[PDB]
Amino acid sequence: DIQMTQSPSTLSASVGDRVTITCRASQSISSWLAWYQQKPGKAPKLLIYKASSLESGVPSRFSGSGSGTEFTLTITSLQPDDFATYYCQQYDSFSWTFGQGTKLE
């Protein structure tokens, strides 16, 4: 399968600050990435599709980057409602494996 390591972990930062998270891949995948939003007690919510592409109904602070293996999600301004969990996803091969996840507070 694909083993994908979410190097950043539980992170603390003040409201309105730059935050960057990375999601390294076992082998290069041609920008076949999905970022998912998760909150406690709530079902997962689709956030970002196709690496660097924003979905409708999502604040513009979220942005994606990275080609092949250096996929990264960057939020320019942190918000109190942004304290939640992010999930990685890849769909290059058919065995669709998520990421370890990162925590925000």
């Binding site: 769909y91 290059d92 058919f94």
Partner: protein, 48 residues
């Protein structure tokens, strides 16, 4: 005394050619940009 059974023995089947991975692919190349994969020095089972 006449022979009853019939046996044949050959070395282990090792190093199968990986055409199975090309046949099952999540992503398929466009017709104009056809992609060539070289299968070489392996045991190929076309009965599958």
């Amino acid at each position: 005394v006449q022979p009853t059974e019939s046996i044949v023995r050959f070395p282990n089947i090792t190093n199968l050619c990986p055409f199975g991975e090309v046949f099952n692919a999540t992503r398929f190349a466009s017709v104009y940009a056809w992609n060539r994969k070289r299968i070489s020095n392996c045991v190929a089972d076309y009965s599958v």
